[PDB]
Design a protein around this ligand. Structure first.
Ligand SMILES: Nc1nc(-c2ccccn2)cs1
Length: 64
């Protein structure tokens, strides 16, 4: 509705989602983006865990 993304994310991009179980940020790939709720279904690479987390929890992959 009035959800203005805090971070410009796209489908098929790598990000760092905050695991709702441990609370730490692991590497995850965006499979789907729901701008209606401001959330995005991400899948942690290597693990296989997929959860719907907001775009505010999605941090950029800082490798440099
Ligand atoms: N099934 C499993 N998932 C994880 C995991 C770890 C970090 C982030 C997401 N998932 C570990 S074992």
């Amino acid at each position: 509705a009035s959800t203005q993304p805090t971070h410009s994310w796209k489908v098929g991009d790598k990000c760092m989602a905050v695991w709702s179980e441990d609370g730490q940020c692991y590497e995850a790939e965006i499979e789907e983006i729901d701008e209606e709720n401001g959330t995005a279904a991400i899948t942690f690479a290597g693990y296989g865990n997929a959860e719907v987390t907001p775009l505010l929890n999605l941090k950029p992959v800082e490798e440099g």
